[PDB]
C-alpha cells in the first residue's frame, strides 16, 4: 500500500532505473517505458507496483530501500524512509 504513496515523491526515471535494476525483467519495463515516454502521472506507481508483485513475501521494504540505493539513486529510498517511518 505504500507503493502508491511512495511513487508520489518519486520520479518516472529514478524509479525507472530502480525496478529495471531489481530483477523486474528489462522487457517488461520496456513496455512501461514506451507506454508513456512523458507521463509521470501514474507511470511512477505502475513501475513501482510491478516490482511489488515481484517479491512481496518477507522483508520487501528492505529490498525497496536497499535496492533503491543500489540502483544508482540513494535519494528515492530517503523520502520513502519518511513514509514507512510515518
Amino acid at each position: 500500500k505504500y507503493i502508491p504513496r511512495i511513487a508520489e515523491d518519486m520520479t518516472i526515471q529514478e524509479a525507472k532505473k530502480f525496478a529495471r535494476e531489481n530483477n523486474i525483467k528489462e522487457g517488461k519495463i520496456d513496455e512501461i517505458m514506451h507506454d508513456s515516454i512523458q507521463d509521470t502521472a501514474e507511470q511512477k506507481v505502475q513501475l513501482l507496483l510491478c516490482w511489488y508483485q515481484s517479491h512481496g513475501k518477507s522483508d520487501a521494504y528492505q529490498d525497496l530501500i536497499k535496492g533503491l540505493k543500489k540502483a544508482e539513486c540513494r535519494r528515492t529510498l530517503d523520502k520513502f524512509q519518511d513514509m514507512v517511518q510515518k
Binding site: 511489488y52 508483485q53 515481484s54 512481496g56 513475501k57
Partner: protein, 92 residues
C-alpha cells in the same frame, strides 16, 4: 473440491486483469480457445478470466486442484494473488 475452486476463482477473477492471457497459457489453455474467449466477452475483463479458469476445470475433472492454480499464478509472477488464493484456502 467444488466450492473451494469457487472461492479461489472469485479471488482470481477479481484480481488478475491485465496479464490474464499469460495466466491462461500457464493453465495449458490452447490459444484456439483463448482467442474465442477474447471474442465472447470483449466487455468485461473479469468474465474472460473466469471463463478461462472454467475451461481449465473441465480439462481436468479430477486434478483441478487449487494447488496447481497457485502454481499457475506463481510461474507468471502473480505472487500476491497466489498468496491471497492460498490464505483463503487455508482459512476454509
Amino acid at each position: 473440491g467444488e466450492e473451494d475452486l469457487c472461492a479461489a476463482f472469485n479471488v482470481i477473477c477479481d484480481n488478475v486483469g491485465k496479464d490474464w492471457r499469460r495466466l491462461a497459457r500457464q493453465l495449458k489453455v490452447s490459444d484456439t480457445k483463448i482467442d474465442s474467449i477474447e471474442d465472447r466477452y470483449p466487455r468485461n475483463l473479469t468474465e474472460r478470466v473466469r471463463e478461462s479458469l472454467r475451461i481449465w476445470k473441465n480439462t481436468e475433472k479430477e486434478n483441478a486442484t487449487v494447488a496447481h492454480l497457485v502454481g499457475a499464478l506463481r510461474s507468471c509472477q502473480m505472487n500476491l494473488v497466489a498468496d491471497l488464493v492460498q490464505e483463503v484456502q487455508q482459512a476454509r
